[PDB]
Design a protein around this ligand. Structure first.
Ligand SMILES: COc1ccc(CNc2nc(N(CCO)CCO)nc3c2ncn3C(C)C)cc1
Ligand SMILES: COc1ccc(CNc2nc(N(CCO)CCO)nc3c2ncn3C(C)C)cc1
Ligand SMILES: [Mg+2]
Ligand SMILES: [Mg+2]
Ligand SMILES: [Zn+2]
Ligand SMILES: [Zn+2]
Lengths: 323, 323
């Protein structure tokens, strides 16, 4: 079993990794084994003097704080976003662009970005007067919580994977991680995309042909959109993966709608199992959200992401053909 | 004692209320008595069907969550900001601008705007890796906490003063209160002031001189700046009041500097009791922060803020003469 797991982890640099198989083969530790593999591949333990036992201890605790009973927003989703960000960071248009600390920030942010997710939306938490919405004043409720949990877990026994960073490095990493995870709130998507479009229209390339990002605003904007693309990458994956992700998020949505229905609330869009069309919802989500985002990202790194965009377009056509 | 307390409360509509005397005469309940007086003066209990015992129960609970051992950010400051906002809301140039719900939001926001303040700054909380800064991801740490406490106290027994508001009224009030209290973070001062200036330059007024504010975005910006002005109203008050407020905030600042010194931290500006000039700091704070804000406010409500601005200018001249 460990032999098969090691074989599957050789695909960590590939779009379309067998992440559900890895989850089973690893004994439901996909986030731990994928993060460890990526940290070794990028030499991050050596670069930042991270003790291997501290890394594994933190990863296992972080993974435990994802809810195993939530159908979509669980440790498999976290592992998938981590691995997707890792591939996007390796795109030729970004070679030598980001520092090791920025790479660490993007990968760590991906790992923690949905930790302790309860399987219901920000709007549900706001409308039900939840303790989370009360704590966070209705503003990026979940995303603020994911950050607080992800950072708090570093203070548990033998969990501070950043123990050997300088103070300035820790301060910079903390700010970057907060900026990235807060950008995963879907209420920020339209303004995030509008800014990405402006960057593409005005983009500068070095004599090396890579993107020129010479200030914090531009650098953090690219990392925010990168992780947001990874979070919205399911429809760009091979169809057998995309369909499994769709089955999972549909189950999560329908469970929220069942709670809204019981409470006498208006059921959120796409959460009514007695009225939803999953196929029409996929085409609309791709047409209005996922393809506009990925087409813009593909323009930024052109032509590095052409095969990803082609897969997204093929998957849209497939779902459309089922209607 | 109760008769002299009632006599001082007759000045509730006037700039320069004897708030420290009210605090003493009321047995350290200035917030409860001033809020109660303002609610009766504005007919808010009958307009919003607030039971008087519920209002008093909430107000006393809220007042109890201001720290009695914090020299400045305590219940007297909260009472002062409430009463200052109450006066600014009655500016003739703002007649007919704000709905009853907007008036309620501004007054409630003022009452809760510093609740549970620990007597140290956001930067101190961030730099000491406090629980508060961990919870709130370094962003408007105190202001998010003040809001969460103020709303959470409504859930205590017989404390829901909004129990008879319609559901849409409660959602609207909550959003406005959040927007207002978050605007009291001093890191937002410059952007807030720039937006107030833009509004002044493009302001539309009636024949008499009454402001016309058609869109919610403009009206919430005025309420944000109004409560911010009330928060920064100490230097515009009669000198005897201003000097008392200065003594209290100096004590609070120096106590923070003592904690920073004990911890071996870099001492915050104006917090080093061994290297401080409180008088020079007043002139500088007036010249760079308080006068630009109040002069812009005075222009927006031209000429209704002239007496307040006159007092600020006299106080600046006096503090300069002590140098
Ligand atoms: C009935 O079942 C399904 C299943 C999937 C979808 C489409 N996928 C996703 N739809 C939505 N939303 C509904 C579409 O607007 C919420 C607003 O974005 N948020 C998503 C999705 N995938 C990820 N996220 C966020 C959690 C990042 C639709 C309906
Ligand atoms: C030695 O003692 C004193 C006493 C008062 C001041 C001047 N007043 C105030 N100074 C400052 N700051 C110090 C720099 O001006 C921080 C923000 O710039 N924040 C204030 C003040 N009054 C209220 N707030 C906020 C809490 C809203 C100076 C030094
Ligand atoms: Mg999320
Ligand atoms: Mg405050
Ligand atoms: Zn996610
Ligand atoms: Zn205040």
């Amino acid at each position: 079993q460990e032999d098969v797991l090691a074989k599957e982890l050789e695909d960590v640099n590939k779009w379309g990794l067998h992440v559900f198989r890895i989850a089973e083969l690893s004994g439901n530790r996909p986030l731990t084994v994928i993060m460890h593999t990526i940290f070794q591949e990028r030499d991050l333990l050596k670069t930042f003097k991270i003790p291997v036992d501290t890394l594994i201890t933190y990863l296992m605790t972080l993974e435990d704080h994802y809810h195993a009973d939530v159908a979509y927003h669980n440790n498999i989703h976290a592992a998938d976003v981590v691995q997707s960000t890792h591939v996007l960071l390796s795109t030729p248009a970004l070679e030598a662009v980001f520092t090791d600390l920025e790479i660490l920030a993007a990968i760590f942010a991906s790992a923690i970005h949905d930790v302790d997710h309860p399987g219901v939306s920000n709007q549900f938490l706001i409308n039900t007067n939840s303790e989370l919405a009360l704590m966070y004043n209705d503003s990026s409720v979940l995303e603020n919580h994911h950050l607080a949990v992800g950072f708090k877990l570093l203070q548990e026994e033998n969990c501070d994977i950043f123990q050997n960073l300088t103070k300035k490095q820790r301060q910079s990493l903390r700010k970057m991680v907060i900026d990235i995870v807060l950008a995963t709130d879907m209420s920020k998507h339209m303004n995030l995309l509008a800014d990405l479009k402006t960057m593409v229209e005005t983009k500068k390339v070095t004599s090396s042909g890579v993107l020129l990002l010479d200030n914090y605003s531009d650098r953090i904007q690219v990392l925010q959109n990168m992780v947001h693309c990874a979070d919205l990458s399911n429809p760009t994956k091979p169809l057998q993966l995309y369909r499994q992700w769709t089955d999972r998020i549909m189950e999560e949505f329908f469970r929220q709608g069942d709670r809204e229905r019981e409470r006498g609330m208006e059921i959120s869009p796409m959460c009514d199992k007695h009225n939803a069309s999953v196929e029409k919802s996929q085409v609309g989500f791709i047409d209005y959200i996922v393809h506009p985002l990925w087409e813009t990202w593909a323009d930024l790194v052109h032509p590095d992401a052409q095969d990803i965009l082609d897969t997204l377009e093929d998957n849209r056509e497939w779902y459309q053909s089922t209607i």
